[PDB]
Amino acid sequence: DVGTVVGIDLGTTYSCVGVFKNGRVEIIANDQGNRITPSYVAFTPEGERLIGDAAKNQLTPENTVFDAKRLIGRTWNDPSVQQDIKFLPFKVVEKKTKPYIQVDIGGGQTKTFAPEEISAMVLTKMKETAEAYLGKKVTHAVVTVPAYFNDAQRQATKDAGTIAGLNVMRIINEPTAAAIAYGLDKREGEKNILVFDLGGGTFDVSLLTIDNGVFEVVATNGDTHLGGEDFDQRVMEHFIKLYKKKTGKDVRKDNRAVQKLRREVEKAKRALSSQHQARIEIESFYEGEDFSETLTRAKFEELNMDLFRSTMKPVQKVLEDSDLKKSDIDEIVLVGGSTRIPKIQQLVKEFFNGKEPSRGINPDEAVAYGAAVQAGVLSG
Numbered sequence: 001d002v003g004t005v006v007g008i009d010l011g012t013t014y015s016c017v018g019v020f021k022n023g024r025v026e027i028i029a030n031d032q033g034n035r036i037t038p039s040y041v042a043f044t045p046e047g048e049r050l051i052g053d054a055a056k057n058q059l060t061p062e063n064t065v066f067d068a069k070r071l072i073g074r075t076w077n078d079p080s081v082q083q084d085i086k087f088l089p090f091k092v093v094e095k096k097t098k099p100y101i102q103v104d105i106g107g108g109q110t111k112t113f114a115p116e117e118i119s120a121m122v123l124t125k126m127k128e129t130a131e132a133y134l135g136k137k138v139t140h141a142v143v144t145v146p147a148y149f150n151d152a153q154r155q156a157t158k159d160a161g162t163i164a165g166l167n168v169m170r171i172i173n174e175p176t177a178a179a180i181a182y183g184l185d186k187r188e189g190e191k192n193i194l195v196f197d198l199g200g201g202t203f204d205v206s207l208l209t210i211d212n213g214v215f216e217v218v219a220t221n222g223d224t225h226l227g228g229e230d231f232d233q234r235v236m237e238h239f240i241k242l243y244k245k246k247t248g249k250d251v252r253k254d255n256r257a258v259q260k261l262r263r264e265v266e267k268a269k270r271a272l273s274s275q276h277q278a279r280i281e282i283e284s285f286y287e288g289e290d291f292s293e294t295l296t297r298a299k300f301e302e303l304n305m306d307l308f309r310s311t312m313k314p315v316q317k318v319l320e321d322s323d324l325k326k327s328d329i330d331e332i333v334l335v336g337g338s339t340r341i342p343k344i345q346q347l348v349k350e351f352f353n354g355k356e357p358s359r360g361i362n363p364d365e366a367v368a369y370g371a372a373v374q375a376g377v378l379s380g
């Protein structure tokens with residue numbers, strides 16, 4: 001009837017899908033062998049619709065859609081939308097009071113998609129990912145949303161699901177799913193949970209309270225324009241300025257050379273979470289002339305220190321807005337791949353006077369894991 005219910009984390013930049021199979025949560029890998037899929041849609045001049053990794057990694061930016069999560073369930077005239085469309089390379093128009101995305105789907109053919117139709121495309125990819133894994137059709141799902149999502153934003157995420165052919169049984173808050181994944185629900189008494197979520201493009205701090213398996217979101221903070229990509233971009237600036245000093249050339253003149261460096265800078269960033277040095281390598285790069293340079297963990301930290309330190313400010317504001325002190329935090333939950341960064345981990349620990357955060361689940365998978373825990377109960 002309800003079949004195997006899937007747990008889907010529908011993120012701004014990345015998405016993740018999990019299932020409960022043979023007594024445990026399984027985080028499913030896509031057709032590219034990745035356990036997280038970029039929340040990207042691209043259209044090639046030939047007319048092919050690309051979703052995920054193929055859409056993000058395609059060398060080309062007017063016909064590449066991403067960050068639909070910033071527009072979903074919002075009106076065109078929403079000041080947040082108006083501010084956001086200034087940074088989006090694709091066209092956004094007013095249609096049916098909403099911010100519809102306009103793209104050439106190939107051969108000069110123009111189409112408009114509501115932000116829930118783009119999220120539906122990402123959700124279809126997640127569903128295809130789970131169906132390939134399970135060997136059968138998926139009809140039902142548990143989809144997570146940020147704790148601050150209002151009525152319209154939650155309904156539009158439910159609508160995205162319906163378009164993708166999914167019955168979104170439950171909409172669950174992302175920090176709550178993160179807490180469920182660490183088994184913080186299975187505890188007795190009253191506990192205060194600080195969820196520190198540093199994603200690809202958004203930073204969210206949530207103060208939750210657990211009272212006998214029952215969660216309550218007390219206060220939320222963060223910065224909607226601070227995430228992992230901002231860290232990639234700081235590294236990008238360093239290498240663009242250095243290539244200017246070493247060759248007198250301007251890398252930014254070739255868009256594909258920028259995308260190549262962006263992909264290499266992102267791989268290097270991930271490597272510096274485990275090791276102390278990473279090398280970037282690109283052929284030919286720019287004007288046939290090759291690219292080979294190194295990045296140290298210490299330099300990455302120095303290029304991003306102000307952005308890293310800025311994350312402590314909303315943590316202070318949630319504590320105040322919940323009338324709590326550092327001593328009142330029983331559990332610290334780290335969410336998002338960016339929390340793998342050793343300096344981010346050091347900063348959060350020292351802010352909580354040596355208190356160690358929960359560890360076990362990968363922070364980039366915790367929300368889909370928690371969603372897959374709830375999906376399991378619902379599957380039976």
Ligand SMILES: Nc1ncnc2c1nc(Br)n2[C@@H]1O[C@H](CO)[C@@H](O)[C@H]1O
Pocket residue numbers: 013014036198199200201227228229266269270271273336337338339340341364
């Ligand atoms: N190991 C890691 N070290 C540093 N960053 C990482 C890591 N893994 C992931 Br995934 N990321 C970044 O997290 C964001 C998505 O949540 C993206 O910007 C990713 O680049």
